[PDB]
A paper describes a structure:
Many malaria vaccine candidates, like RTS,S, are based on P. falciparum circumsporozoite protein (PfCSP), which is the primary surface antigen of P. falciparum sporozoites, the stage of malaria parasites infectious to humans. Cryo-electron microscopy (cryo-EM) reveals a remarkable spectrum of helical antibody-PfCSP structures stabilized by homotypic interactions between tightly packed fragments antigen binding (Fabs), many of which correlate with somatic hypermutation. In each complex, CSP displays some form of helical structure that is stabilized by homotypic interfaces between tightly packed Fabs bound along the length of the NPNA repeats.
T28 is a germline residue that is nearly strictly conserved (S28 in 337), while the S31N mutation is seen in four of the seven mAbs: 239, 311, 334, and 356. Interestingly, we observed some helical propensity in the 239R-rsCSP complex, similar to 311R, suggesting helical structure formation is at least partially germline-encoded or that CSP has a preferential bias toward a helical conformation.
Residue numbers in the entry:
A (entry chain T), E (entry chain V), G (entry chain R), K (entry chain L), L (entry chain P), M (entry chain N), ...: 1 to 95, 95A, 96 to 107
B (entry chain S), D (entry chain U), F (entry chain Q), H (entry chain H), I (entry chain O), J (entry chain M): 1 to 52, 52A, 53 to 82, 82A, 82B, 82C, 83 to 100, 100A, ...
C (entry chain I): 28 to 80
């Protein structure tokens, strides 16, 4: 399998700031990634697929990019809602689906 | 707006079996592949199984090979995952999931609520 | 000393590169193959079924 | 010469249900599949759903999965679509269609005029 | 789903010339492409299926070509009744039907 | 849990043929490539062959090229290796195998018990 | 082929000790190695893959490292159950899978 | 056990064409690249050409560059070498070959019987 | 028998561009690096440029550094040399060449017919 | 036509660092070693550094030993010289250069335009 | 190309003797050499690869040695079945495959 | 660059004599030299490479010799077909390929 | 390093005359010199390398001569354009490259 | 719809000759193709179904072959009564019945 590493483990930010979350691959996974948001107590939901495409119904503030093993999730202006746990998921062909540890967004 | 409910959880002894159900509502069940996603109490997310739209092929994560058997029955519109020979690393919340439907995109969009499965003594 | 490249280095291909298939490929099915049904499958009836009793 | 008459529209509030009909004329409804096509005010065409010749199988786009329900009644020559849990993005002119009938070609030949649905308050 | 992008969005021409409209695919669709022309106040009518085959009743000045992701709809000679919005639609297997943005051809 | 039981052993004269089987249980047979691993009486481990998931490709160690043939048949969940033109070296304990399934990692996880083949006079 | 040679042929130690087993490659094999433990009367089982990654369910006292032609399997604290035969197996691309001779672990 | 048999030899005037075949038996032909080796009557050994497993790349000795075309057909389990513009130097006994399959060693293990080609008048 | 035909010649004014081609035939063009050789009207021979088999590296004579660019298209079996900022000393017959293929001998064997380029007004 | 454009100059205080660039154009930059040449206001020239084609070796004048670092990026077709612990003697316009390419001639042919670097307070 | 010279052209010996056949290269071929034995009426068979390694199934009485351009094939004890023509073949990288002249072993 | 000077520029000779053509290098070129024969109206053909080896298909009456800076091409018995312009070309390492001025052969 | 002194510092001359610039090395530099011409505001241009060889594209009126520690650059017929500053450079092996002080040519 | 092309359009031959008419479908039609003979003033009569099976009462001189896209009718020995227009028809499932263009057999 492929080990998914996302850094930082936990970073705090204030409303209106710019926060970027990366995800590191053990080896190349093409551009087949997916970012997940999990509010505590709630099942997680999809934001980005194909590592760059915004899913329908998700605000355009969320933004992802990167290729190969470097992938970053970028938040244009962090709002009080977006405080949650963020996961990066890969679905490369011939390899099994794994997730990251989960970056945490903490207020102030 | 597409709700997946799961049932059949509880607490069982190690090595015992248990059945899970993922009865769906208002979703076109027979035309969509479905997954099972496991979230350990350590907040880690791990994929478990996936079954094709007619159940022609089944895939499992290596950690659960030979122990978990999953199947789909389109007629009454529910999904099953039968558990055999469990152990202490299967204590987790179990999420039903639905593949988005992309040509090559295996991403989950309508997650289920989740049913807790605990094994201890 | 000459700091430049060698303009007369062997520019041809290698006629002794390994001419074989890789015995260690990934010999497995693809777990991430499209698991869904085909929405573009022909939804029309067959006009060529038997018209006789 | 095959003309498709569609009706049942109007203005509805977000979250309320609405029914659209696609009563046909002189077309062999039973042996042909049918399609719903949504033309947004921004001059874009989005495919909505397709129903098989006898209703055996049923497909939807991702944006309308679980919120839209189509049905096919061969008896009185109509195609039906029930429209539920709406919001603003569903405000568009709704076109009926008929797949040409090729072996592998999903192409519409005899389009309907369109019945326009407003989601507003 | 496949984002099916047609360029140019708007191209002006006068009656009698040669005008070509193309449509870009995000990934390979083989030859399962279709073209529709939409005059204002009327539903679109099919012209080309299989990305190259003229539909019945379609004038011979209409012509489609291309494969994979690169396709071209070529006008043999633009006529006064050929001024409308043109769309590109694909029906690739195991994929959902999507349309193009719609190219507008305008007088002079 | 996945166990591999091999059979078809015995003692044969040099130059005769022999059929082997690796009827598997509780494993998703069609989704995994398999190997055959040979352990000589001198406690040396030697790889023999490998067949892909659907049987498209086969690779053999040069020690058995042109003499050994593996065949996979998914329907009854079994693996075959039929031997021709044996000799004194080919006397060893034969294990089944199941490739772990990694992206590029060729490792064996669920080894079989082992079936003994003797070539003598 | 590529010859797998591991040293020492036999290494005896008592419970609680730390032992290192080295495997020498005839030519560079990158990092695609594995270590197997054969308890007599049983088929060998998997311990390490990719020459550094611990398998699932293996005790963490087993450690592997190295790249190229010099690789080492290290046991942090030798345990009463850990007396068996150890092999080094490589699966380098375009080369066939070969095994070593196998080191014996003997009590005291 | 793997045997290679050649055919298609005979007598040809200089400047005519000729086709040579290396139909193989019991060899996993698709996985192995194949060479052609030419032995002149003076007991000298010359290498002719090599084709990869899929036929992606070819390499010829300079003495036959542009005159010899070798092609491999995996489906019929055979190899072809077509000769154009022959002369007195191309009269020899032609052996097929089979690269041993190692990482970096280009050596031949299973030679064929050989087919004789005569260029004279 | 390996023939190289060059084209694209003519007359151009100084400072203008010009493209040259070396469409090869019956040669395994992909395996061989190629050279361009210029023969001045004074019957002198000047080496111009060389490109490797896959185009990884290019080398130019100091008289054409930065003004001449050579590129190779393996798919169409042809070689290109594009010249910019020409002047009077570049008026000559341009010969395509083919490196012999030896380990360390950069010697041309199969030359082309030749293309004449005139720079005047 | 080979143009070397430098940048990154300005005025800095003694003891501060400063980075210079030598972005080249139309030159086969990877195959040529490059030099930096310093021209003092007294109109005297001084050599600074040389970098080999692939970065294997570097040589510096003794007046810049350990304070100047020169690095080359073949992919971006540019040359870098970063100075550390600058002092008053380093006020001069800095030239890029390209070694002629001869077997034993370290002579500069295609000089750059020039970048003025001032150190003061 | 690289020409291969093997000496002597002919070397006669009787049963039980020890003989050495050399192969001299025009330029360094590292250890990429092979030795072939051709009996009359048959295609040559592989004896040594990598200039020192024994091929499978060949009696161990043959031994190879050398590096660079000077290489030696030694038969420890001549046998009645080992009387044939011997060829040395190189496979140096970036150089094409060539063979030697062929040493002959004649009885008595 | 290394400029080649081949001397003398022109030798008249008849059929059957022996002619020697020299090529002088300004600096050592080891043995990396090649000789070309250009008949008028044709592209030159390769005769000698490595300054002593005969190219395939060239009649044996051509012979080359010398190393360092003094290299000679010798035609043992001139034939009526052997009247052409002869160029010496070096390919020394780390130096660019250059050609000689061209020696001509004139009948009688 | 090797200090270079060239004399005279300033050499006044008119159009059509003949000037000689001398460049004396403090120690023998064999024949490894180079002569540069710098026009005001421009990067210096190469004229002579190897102390006697004319660089490409330089008018033939420039001539270099000398060996050892005494070298001369002579302009056959000074042209209005050839009024500039001239620098001599050595690149002797095992020594670092140094430039001259700069000889100026002044009109009249 | 499926479009078949049958070649040649017209094939003239004499009595006793052997003639082969082909039928190429736009896409694979398995074996669901049938051939007909049509004499002037008469409706076409069936010759072969399943593209290979002879109809009752049809002379054995007519034989059909082919599958997929390439099919052929062969009349082994042309007789005077076999001068007519012959067509090919497909009945592939999920496809509508369309019909070919036509090969005509003409006397001499």
């Amino acid at each position: 399998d492929i080990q998914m590493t996302q850094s930082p483990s936990t970073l705090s930010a204030s409303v209106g700031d710019r926060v970027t979350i990366t995800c590191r691959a053990s080896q190349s996974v093409s551009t087949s990634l997916a970012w997940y948001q999990q509010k505590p107590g709630k099942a997680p939901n999809l934001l980005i697929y194909q590592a760059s495409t915004l899913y329908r119904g998700v605000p355009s503030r969320f933004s992802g990019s990167g290729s190969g093993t470097e992938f970053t999730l970028t938040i244009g202006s962090l709002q009080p809602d977006d405080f949650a746990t963020y996961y990066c998921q890969h679905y490369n062909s011939y390899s099994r689906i794994t997730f990251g540890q989960g970056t945490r967004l903490e207020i102030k | 707006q597409v709700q997946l409910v799961e049932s059949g959880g509880g607490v069982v002894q190690p090595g015992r079996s248990l059945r899970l159900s993922c009865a769906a509502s208002r979703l076109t069940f027979r035309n969509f592949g479905m997954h099972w996603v496991r979230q350990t109490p350590g907040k880690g997310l791990e994929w478990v199984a996936v079954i094709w739209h007619d159940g022609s092929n089944k895939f499992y994560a290596d950690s659960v090979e030979g122990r978990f058997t999953i199947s789909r029955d389109n007629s009454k519109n529910t999904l099953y995952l039968q558990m055999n020979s469990l152990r202490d690393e299967d204590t987790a919340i179990y999420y039903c999931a639905k593949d988005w439907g992309g040509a090559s995109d295996r991403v989950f969009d309508y997650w289920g609520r989740g049913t807790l499965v605990i094994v201890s003594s | 000393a000459n700091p430049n490249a060698n303009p007369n280095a062997n520019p041809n291909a290698n006629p002794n590169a390994n001419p074989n298939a890789n015995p260690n490929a990934n010999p497995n099915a693809n777990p991430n193959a499209n698991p869904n049904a085909n929405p573009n499958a022909n939804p029309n009836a067959n006009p060529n079924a038997n018209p006789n009793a």
